């Protein structure tokens, strides 16, 4: 019986086809701050500070930044509760997470609308529901039917 630290990671901790190589310069240049949402994704070409397989593909908040490492808080269910596990990884195994992108865009749009209404400018026209009825004026009208050729065709040989 075998349950190693990296047990069952043959396809998990592997590069995608024709995408091998050391991490990129953008990864080195990304600034990680305490409170940033990050995705924990293991980079198989580093093998230092690599997260345990459980935390691959989890998103959490940064609680700590060290010169070469990142502390992330990750939710982990166990029995009847979810713990807040603080994992330590090298910066190469985190990506700036986009989990709040739609919410930030929504807040930005609301500030912009507030400014426009304060200024008395023209608000954008409202989108309309596509589910409302109306007249349809067809261009081509065809008969939907089963023909002989369909049964003839879908037989092989």
In whole angstroms, give the CA distance from residue 119 to residue 83: 48
Q: Which is nearer to another protein, 53 or 97 (CB)?
A: 97
Binders in 59-118 for RNA, by CB under 7 A: 59-60, 64, 66-71, 74-80, 82-83, 85-90, 95, 97-103, 106-107, 109-111, 113-114
User: In this chain, which of 119, 122, 127, 140 binds RNA, going by CB under 7 A?
Assistant: 127
Interface with Mg ion, residue 10, by CB under 5 A: no
- Using DSSP's 3-state secondary structure scheme, residue 128 falls into coil
CB of 120 to RNA, least distance (A): 14
For 63, the enclosing helix (H) or strand (E) is strand 58-65
In whole angstroms, give the CA distance from residue 106 to residue 28: 30
Strands 58-65 and 69-78: antiparallel
CB of 14 to Mg ion, least distance (A): 5
Contact between 71 and 64 (Cβ < 8 Å): yes
Question: Which positions touch Mg ion (CB under 5 A)?
Answer: 11, 14
């Amino acid at each position: 019986h075998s349950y190693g630290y990296k047990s069952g990671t043959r396809h998990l901790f592997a590069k995608k086809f024709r995408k091998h190589g050391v991490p990129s310069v953008s990864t080195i240049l990304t600034n990680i701050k305490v409170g940033d949402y990050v995705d924990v994704v293991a980079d198989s070409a580093v093998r230092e500070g690599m997260p345990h397989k459980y935390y691959h593909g989890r998103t959490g908040i940064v609680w700590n930044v060290t010169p070469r490492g990142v502390g992330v808080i990750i939710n982990k269910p166990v029995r009847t509760r979810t713990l807040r596990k603080r994992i330590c990884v090298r910066f190469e195994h985190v990506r700036k997470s986009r989990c709040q992108e739609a919410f930030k865009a929504k807040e930005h749009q609301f500030q912009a609308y507030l400014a426009a209404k304060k200024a008395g400018k023209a608000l954008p026209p409202l989108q309309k529901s596509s589910r409302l009825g109306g007249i349809v004026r067809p261009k081509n009208v065809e008969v939907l039917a089963r023909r002989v050729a369909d049964y003839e065709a879908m037989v092989p040989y």
